[PDB]
Amino acid sequence: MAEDADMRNELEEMQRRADQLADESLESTRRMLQLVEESK
């Protein structure tokens, strides 16, 4: 089941891709707020 194990790991890799995307979104939102506050 080694190959099936790696298939599961690929699924978890897709899950971590979603997580990474959410993280960089969170960072983008923070940068939004910082710049918007700065302009004033």
Partner 1 sequence: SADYYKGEESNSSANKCLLKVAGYAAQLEQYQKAIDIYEQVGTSAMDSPLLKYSAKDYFFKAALCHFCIDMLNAKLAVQKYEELFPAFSDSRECKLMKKLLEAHEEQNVDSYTESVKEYDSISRLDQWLTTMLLRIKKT
Binding of partner 1 at residue 39 (CB under 8 A)? Answer: no
Distance CA 15, CA 8 (A): 11
Binding of partner 1 at residue 4 (CB under 8 A)? Answer: no
Looking from the CA of 38 toward its CB, the CA atoms found within 13 Å total 6
Q: Which of 21, 22, 32, 33 binds partner 1 (CB under 8 A)?
A: 33
DSSP state of 1: -
Q: Which of 3, 18, 37, 39 binds partner 1 (CB under 8 A)?
A: 37
Amino acid at position 17, single letter: R
Binding of partner 1 at residue 36 (CB under 8 A)? Answer: no
Q: Point out which residues bind partner 1 (CB under 8 A).
A: 33-34, 37-38
